[PDB]
């Protein structure tokens, strides 16, 4: 019948629901702590940067494949580095305060990572790939939800040192993403204003994702490092499965790799400068 | 030709933009002490109510719920938004006609925003879908404004009224979007403008001391317009108003009873 991916999806969605309900219940039993505010601001920055990129498509009505390969390589490189330096490693530091240090902390983050990958892997396998247009639009609007989620997760401590570099890196990555989303939507056949409209709307999952992110991470002390892994795993999958294969659209692999390494090193700079 | 509605809409949208930017700037640069946790809890509740409605996919039982919500919404507009807005403005400029002016500005802007948003609701489906989803934005904003101070005594009554409103609206939005699958999906997505709107509602109400009573009037004026121009007259499309008339009476009376606990 079905692969174990279906069981992974079910257990990951159940885990997300359990984490999110634990968040709500705790938020219904605790008071006077800011940590929603920066997650909201960071998600709003994500929306605004995604809109800025999309609006550039109105004039730059198409770009060379070399530019696409460069742009999405840069986007991929930023988000792989951000998953490592701003999610996984601070998750291991956080889980090191509770059950670790040492591999007890790694088990908590690996539980996160597996849930994040199995969620996104399951969601992809339940796309059939009644039109490409509607399936692709649905895919696009949801695409930024793990980016919001990473924002809200990283800010769930209120810590500028963790959330600001990731949010800056996502915000910077959102401009290529929103532009490339808008131009892809045009190429599918939507009028450019309708394509740019949907691309702007895709940024609304970045605030909404940041609400989900601050939720799932708040219910209990280990829900934070679990959610750090979950956001990292969801991002890592989405980068490896959505973004990176679109960086080879006409074989400009050198251009794509220069973008990747530039984005990776830029994210390392952002964390070194803002952390 | 284009009446003063065009001016009033544009000036009120500029007011929303101004208020929101002031709230952002205060958040980024002030010792901001605004409450937003309850607002996103209330906005998520509004989404969930709108989703449940869409998953419900004669009209007289819906007219009963629409009348009941409308009653709850009018009472919450008066007792939860306008009067604590007047008390808030009475902490700064008033009491008396000075405090009344600050809330009346809010009420005007709120009314004018909705009066303009209604203006445009062939493939005109795109404009219908746009207006459909955005209709939940002011509902979100009112929730956010009601929770901006963290008073459960204010945020719970209004958010309940809007959540009860959201159940018939979810069904109505799905049904008015007409298989049902992508229509109910878009109805579920429409509910997501209430969490988003609740962030906007907290934002506009936060830049400066008077931004709270202005936004309380703005929330109240928008929701009163929604009731007076949409939710109530939607009944007379079906049968007669009577069942919603009893809904209006009962919902209004219940709300002020719960306020008198």
Residue numbers in the entry:
A (entry chain A): 21 to 149, 164 to 309
B (entry chain B): 21 to 77, 84 to 147, 164 to 220, 225 to 307
Question: What do the paper's sentences say?
Answer:
The Zrt/Irt-like protein (ZIP) family of solute carrier 39A (SLC39A) membrane transporters is critical in maintaining appropriate cellular levels of zinc. ZIPs represent the only identified zinc importers in mammals, providing metal transfer from the extracellular space or from internal storage vesicles to the cytoplasm. The identified ZIP fold is unique and consists primarily of a transmembrane domain of eight pseudo-symmetrically arranged transmembrane segments (TMs) 1 to 8. Together, they form two separate helix bundles encompassing TM1, TM4, TM5, and TM6 and TM2, TM3, TM7, and TM8, respectively.
We hypothesized that pH reduction would metal strip BbZIP and found that the protein is stable over weeks at pH 4.5 in the absence of Zn2+ or its congener Cd2+ in the buffer. With such treated sample, we crystallized BbZIP in the lipidic cubic phase (LCP) using metal-free conditions at pH 4.5. Notably, even initial analysis disclosed that the new structure is metal-free, as the metal-binding region is void of density or anomalous signal from bound cation. Overall, the metal-bound and metal-free structures are reminiscent, each displaying an inward-open configuration of TM1 to TM8. However, the latter uncovers an additional, approximately 30-residue-long and tilted transmembrane segment (here termed TMa) in the N terminus. By investigating the crystal packing in our metal-free BbZIP structure, we identify two separate dimers displaying a parallel (i.e., inside-in/inside-in) crystal packing. Detailed structural comparisons of the metal-free and metal-bound inward-open structures expose notable differences for one of the two protomers (chain B), with an overall RMSD of 1.75 Å (hereafter referred to as the ion-free structure). The analysis reveals a considerable displacement of the transport domain, with the ion-free form being shifted around 3 Å toward the intracellular inside, combined with a substantial twist that tilts the domain 11°. Thereby, the Zn2+-binding region is directly exposed to the cytoplasm, in agreement with completion of ion release during the course of a transport cycle. The resolved part represents 30 N-terminal amino acids and a highly tilted helix, interacting only with TM3 and TM6 and peripherally relative to the dimer assembly.
